[PDB]
Design a binder for this molecule. Structure first.
Ligand SMILES: Nc1ncnc2c1ncn2[C@@H]1O[C@H](COP(=O)(O)O)[C@@H](O)[C@H]1O
Ligand SMILES: Nc1ncnc2c1ncn2[C@@H]1O[C@H](COP(=O)(O)O)[C@@H](O)[C@H]1O
Ligand SMILES: [Mg+2]
Ligand SMILES: [Mg+2]
Ligand SMILES: [Mg+2]
Ligand SMILES: [Mg+2]
Ligand code: NA
Ligand code: NA
Lengths: 238, 238
């Protein structure tokens, strides 16, 4: 059925109860300047529990995305830290020379962000909010043990269009509502160009609506190759 | 009903089939110089599929543990790399200054090792073998998204004594058989001192055998504080 006001209150209540029962003090989240993290952070703040945002740029990230995240942080009035992952990434990369890719880079960088978030989380007894929505989950458009690694996933049942509706309801900065969804691996990269299918097509597919043959091919391809990303590690039946 | 020979062959067959069906070309494993990773590496090698070992010391690690891992690699005749994680760890740790203890250090290093393993695996189409045995799993004595993060867990149904039995059967070097189980964070650190409970006690508990009230107090304390380490992230049911 979905309406932003009601679904937002249910999520706020579920985050709050989940955090108290965990048990933990509050939340930490990575703020990319994108819509999923903007929405998840806004929801976490409404619980009234301590919420901290990390901004973790690499050199491939855009200044506007940093500024959009900072603007949200100002509006939300939350504790925050901005730390470049680039020096750690560069040291890690250099140290891999004896056995050496853009995807390999993207995945290392996601895992470095996980390390920052869990470092903070352990210091302040927080839980880490993962921002995966239903489209990213189904497509496996996330890094295993990177952005796919979290304690709690408030958006994972939401269509992208529902994420946007929550954004509008929650007064997320306009530029976050209007910008192209992007992993931020290079300037001009967009999720939809990378996937070869639009979010509207994925959402329609999730809804059991007709999509084109090419959309369906891409949806099936992404979903098929990502089965292990969604499940626990394989263990013996003996 | 455990027998080293029979179980070993079952595990080797399962590793092989699991890897073939993944699909992947082979394995990668972090070798600490301890028994769990020694046994897991030996099993992987027996599948006849490409198997690479990474040795990933930090300055906290004991030189003997690197030497024992190297000794095993020589015996197994496998591709391997020895890479200090210290440069990457120091860049990471320095960068956390604004918000930032030994447990946190230990956890960051374990997640760095995860990064190395996955960087290799993705470059060479391998799957990452996790070395968690039934004791570590139950006690949650592993880092979430560090050594607890892998593609496949061949040892996770095994008691520590059964891991050692496999070690003996697989001709793992004597010093690895005889040394104290240890996370390697400082000289003289031992798992049993850390947990306050012996592996024999944990193993007996897992088997439904009587243990002391002291033992049982340490077992439930560890198991209780780690419920979420074993499971997937919390998701809404709505
Ligand atoms: N530069 C960044 N700073 C902080 N968090 C980030 C950054 N880039 C990505 N993330 C986190 O990673 C998640 C996945 O991003 P995306 O790949 O665009 O779906 C985001 O929702 C953020 O929580
Ligand atoms: N120095 C190291 N080099 C490579 N892998 C390691 C090292 N230390 C720990 N590991 C990995 O982490 C796993 C867990 O170690 P432990 O914490 O001793 O149970 C080991 O089985 C290894 O696979
Ligand atoms: Mg996203
Ligand atoms: Mg993004
Ligand atoms: Mg171990
Ligand atoms: Mg060890
Ligand atoms: Na994205
Ligand atoms: Na150990």
């Amino acid at each position: 059925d979905f309406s932003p006001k009601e679904y937002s209150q249910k999520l706020v209540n579920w985050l709050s109860d989940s955090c108290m029962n965990y048990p933990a003090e509050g939340f930490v989240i990575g703020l990319s300047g994108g819509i999923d993290s903007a929405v998840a952070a806004s929801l976490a703040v409404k619980t009234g529990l301590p919420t901290t945002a990390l901004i973790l740029p690499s050199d491939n990230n855009q200044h506007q995305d940093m500024q959009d995240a900072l603007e949200l942080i100002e509006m939300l009035n939350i504790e925050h830290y901005t730390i470049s992952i680039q020096p750690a990434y560069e040291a890690f990369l250099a140290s891999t020379q004896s056995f050496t890719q853009l995807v390999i880079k993207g995945n290392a960088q996601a895992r470095l962000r996980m390390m920052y978030l869990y470092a903070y989380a352990q210091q302040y007894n927080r839980i880490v909010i993962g921002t995966d929505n239903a489209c990213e989950w189904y497509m496996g458009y996330f890094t295993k043990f990177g952005d796919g690694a979290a304690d709690i996933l408030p958006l994972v049942n939401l269509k992208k269009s529902q994420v946007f509706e929550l954004g509008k309801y929650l007064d997320v900065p306009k530029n976050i509502l209007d910008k192209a969804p992007s992993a931020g691996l290079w300037q001009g990269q967009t999720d939809e160009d990378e996937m070869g299918v639009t979010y509207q097509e994925i959402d329609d597919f999730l809804d059991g609506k007709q999509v084109s043959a090419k959309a369906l091919e891409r949806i099936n391809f992404w979903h098929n190759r990502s089965h292990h990303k969604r499940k626990l590690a394989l263990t013996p039946n003996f």
